[PDB]
Design a protein around this ligand. Sequence first.
Ligand SMILES: Oc1cccc(Cl)c1
Ligand SMILES: [Cl-]
Ligand SMILES: [Cl-]
Length: 162
Amino acid sequence: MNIFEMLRIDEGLRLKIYKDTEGYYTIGIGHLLTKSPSLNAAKSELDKAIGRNCNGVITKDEAEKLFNQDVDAAVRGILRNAKLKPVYDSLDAVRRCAAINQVFQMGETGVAGFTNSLRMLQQKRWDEAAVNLAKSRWYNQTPNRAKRVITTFRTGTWDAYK
Ligand SMILES: Oc1cccc(Cl)c1
Ligand SMILES: [Cl-]
Ligand SMILES: [Cl-]
Protein backbone atom coordinates (compact mmCIF):
# COMPACT_ATOMS: atom_id res chain seq x y z
CA MET A 1 0.00 0.00 0.00
CA ASN A 2 1.16 3.57 -0.70
CA ILE A 3 -0.31 7.08 -0.84
CA PHE A 4 -1.60 6.71 -4.44
CA GLU A 5 -3.46 3.49 -3.86
CA MET A 6 -4.77 4.86 -0.64
CA LEU A 7 -6.09 8.03 -2.07
CA ARG A 8 -7.29 6.25 -5.14
CA ILE A 9 -9.41 4.22 -2.81
CA ASP A 10 -10.74 7.25 -0.95
CA GLU A 11 -11.44 9.50 -3.98
CA GLY A 12 -12.48 7.04 -6.70
CA LEU A 13 -11.85 7.82 -10.44
CA ARG A 14 -14.24 9.71 -12.71
CA LEU A 15 -13.52 10.80 -16.18
CA LYS A 16 -16.40 13.30 -16.50
CA ILE A 17 -16.99 16.47 -14.56
CA TYR A 18 -18.74 15.58 -11.29
CA LYS A 19 -19.84 17.22 -8.09
CA ASP A 20 -18.06 16.20 -4.93
CA THR A 21 -19.51 15.57 -1.50
CA GLU A 22 -19.59 19.36 -0.93
CA GLY A 23 -21.25 20.00 -4.31
CA TYR A 24 -18.20 21.23 -6.15
CA TYR A 25 -17.05 20.55 -9.57
CA THR A 26 -14.30 18.05 -9.65
CA ILE A 27 -12.84 15.40 -11.91
CA GLY A 28 -10.53 12.46 -12.20
CA ILE A 29 -9.08 11.36 -8.86
CA GLY A 30 -10.49 13.92 -6.57
CA HIS A 31 -9.27 16.92 -8.53
CA LEU A 32 -11.18 19.97 -7.50
CA LEU A 33 -11.80 22.29 -10.35
CA THR A 34 -13.71 25.16 -8.89
CA LYS A 35 -15.95 26.13 -6.07
CA SER A 36 -18.17 28.09 -8.28
CA PRO A 37 -21.52 26.80 -9.32
CA SER A 38 -20.92 27.72 -13.05
CA LEU A 39 -20.37 24.58 -15.03
CA ASN A 40 -18.87 26.78 -17.65
CA ALA A 41 -16.34 27.98 -15.15
CA ALA A 42 -15.54 24.42 -14.37
CA LYS A 43 -15.04 23.43 -18.02
CA SER A 44 -12.79 26.34 -18.51
CA GLU A 45 -10.69 25.37 -15.52
CA LEU A 46 -10.53 21.91 -16.84
CA ASP A 47 -9.24 23.01 -20.24
CA LYS A 48 -6.73 25.25 -18.61
CA ALA A 49 -5.52 22.36 -16.42
CA ILE A 50 -5.29 19.81 -19.24
CA GLY A 51 -4.09 22.04 -21.93
CA ARG A 52 -6.87 21.36 -24.43
CA ASN A 53 -10.53 21.59 -25.13
CA CYS A 54 -11.92 18.75 -23.04
CA ASN A 55 -15.59 19.39 -23.17
CA GLY A 56 -15.84 18.08 -19.54
CA VAL A 57 -14.20 14.73 -20.32
CA ILE A 58 -10.63 13.49 -19.82
CA THR A 59 -8.63 10.34 -20.32
CA LYS A 60 -7.30 8.01 -17.57
CA ASP A 61 -3.75 9.10 -18.26
CA GLU A 62 -4.91 12.70 -18.03
CA ALA A 63 -6.55 11.88 -14.75
CA GLU A 64 -3.41 10.14 -13.53
CA LYS A 65 -1.35 13.05 -14.51
CA LEU A 66 -3.50 15.49 -12.55
CA PHE A 67 -3.24 13.10 -9.59
CA ASN A 68 0.48 13.01 -9.57
CA GLN A 69 0.77 16.66 -9.66
CA ASP A 70 -1.78 16.88 -6.88
CA VAL A 71 -0.03 14.50 -4.51
CA ASP A 72 3.08 16.31 -5.15
CA ALA A 73 1.64 19.66 -4.45
CA ALA A 74 0.16 18.42 -1.22
CA VAL A 75 3.40 17.08 0.19
CA ARG A 76 5.13 20.19 -0.84
CA GLY A 77 2.42 22.24 0.72
CA ILE A 78 3.15 20.38 3.95
CA LEU A 79 6.84 20.87 3.92
CA ARG A 80 6.38 24.52 3.27
CA ASN A 81 4.10 24.98 6.25
CA ALA A 82 5.95 25.89 9.50
CA LYS A 83 3.19 24.64 11.75
CA LEU A 84 2.92 21.40 9.64
CA LYS A 85 6.44 20.34 8.72
CA PRO A 86 7.56 19.54 12.17
CA VAL A 87 4.57 17.34 12.81
CA TYR A 88 4.95 15.56 9.60
CA ASP A 89 8.64 14.93 10.07
CA SER A 90 8.02 13.44 13.46
CA LEU A 91 5.81 10.71 12.10
CA ASP A 92 6.59 7.27 10.65
CA ALA A 93 5.90 6.38 7.04
CA VAL A 94 2.31 5.11 7.33
CA ARG A 95 1.09 7.95 9.47
CA ARG A 96 2.72 10.34 7.01
CA CYS A 97 0.42 8.90 4.40
CA ALA A 98 -2.54 9.72 6.56
CA ALA A 99 -1.32 13.43 6.88
CA ILE A 100 -1.04 13.70 3.07
CA ASN A 101 -4.56 12.29 2.67
CA GLN A 102 -6.12 14.79 5.00
CA VAL A 103 -4.29 17.65 3.34
CA PHE A 104 -5.24 16.41 -0.09
CA GLN A 105 -8.81 16.36 0.97
CA MET A 106 -9.06 19.56 2.81
CA GLY A 107 -6.23 21.74 1.90
CA GLU A 108 -3.46 23.07 4.17
CA THR A 109 -6.03 25.50 5.23
CA GLY A 110 -8.66 23.09 6.40
CA VAL A 111 -5.98 21.34 8.30
CA ALA A 112 -4.61 24.36 10.08
CA GLY A 113 -7.72 24.19 12.50
CA PHE A 114 -6.57 20.73 13.74
CA THR A 115 -3.97 22.35 15.96
CA ASN A 116 -4.91 20.46 18.98
CA SER A 117 -4.88 17.17 17.23
CA LEU A 118 -1.60 18.06 15.64
CA ARG A 119 -0.05 18.52 18.94
CA MET A 120 -1.27 15.17 20.15
CA LEU A 121 0.02 13.45 17.12
CA GLN A 122 3.35 15.14 17.57
CA GLN A 123 3.41 13.87 21.08
CA LYS A 124 2.60 10.34 19.85
CA ARG A 125 -0.58 10.12 21.95
CA TRP A 126 -2.43 8.09 19.37
CA ASP A 127 -5.62 7.14 21.03
CA GLU A 128 -5.99 10.68 22.27
CA ALA A 129 -5.42 12.20 18.84
CA ALA A 130 -7.99 9.80 17.31
CA VAL A 131 -10.65 10.95 19.67
CA ASN A 132 -9.80 14.63 19.12
CA LEU A 133 -9.80 14.19 15.36
CA ALA A 134 -13.37 12.76 15.40
CA LYS A 135 -14.70 15.85 17.01
CA SER A 136 -14.87 17.70 13.78
CA ARG A 137 -17.01 18.69 10.87
CA TRP A 138 -14.73 16.56 8.68
CA TYR A 139 -15.45 13.34 10.51
CA ASN A 140 -19.21 14.22 10.72
CA GLN A 141 -19.40 15.03 7.05
CA THR A 142 -17.46 12.08 5.59
CA PRO A 143 -17.42 9.61 8.41
CA ASN A 144 -16.47 6.44 6.50
CA ARG A 145 -13.36 8.01 5.00
CA ALA A 146 -12.53 9.96 8.18
CA LYS A 147 -12.65 6.66 9.97
CA ARG A 148 -10.07 5.01 7.77
CA VAL A 149 -7.68 7.94 8.10
CA ILE A 150 -8.14 8.17 11.85
CA THR A 151 -7.49 4.50 12.24
CA THR A 152 -4.46 4.97 10.17
CA PHE A 153 -3.17 7.64 12.42
CA ARG A 154 -4.14 5.71 15.51
CA THR A 155 -2.43 2.50 14.52
CA GLY A 156 0.38 3.23 12.18
CA THR A 157 -0.79 0.22 9.95
CA TRP A 158 -2.88 -0.12 6.72
CA ASP A 159 -5.58 -2.21 8.27
CA ALA A 160 -8.45 0.20 7.54
CA TYR A 161 -7.52 -0.09 3.95
CA LYS A 162 -7.25 -3.87 4.45
O1 LIG B 1 -3.35 16.98 8.42
C1 LIG B 1 -2.17 16.70 9.05
C2 LIG B 1 -2.21 15.88 10.17
C3 LIG B 1 -1.01 15.57 10.79
C4 LIG B 1 0.24 16.02 10.36
C5 LIG B 1 0.24 16.85 9.25
CL1 LIG B 1 1.44 17.33 8.79
C6 LIG B 1 -0.94 17.18 8.59
CL1 LIG C 1 -2.45 21.02 -14.57
CL1 LIG D 1 -17.01 8.97 3.81
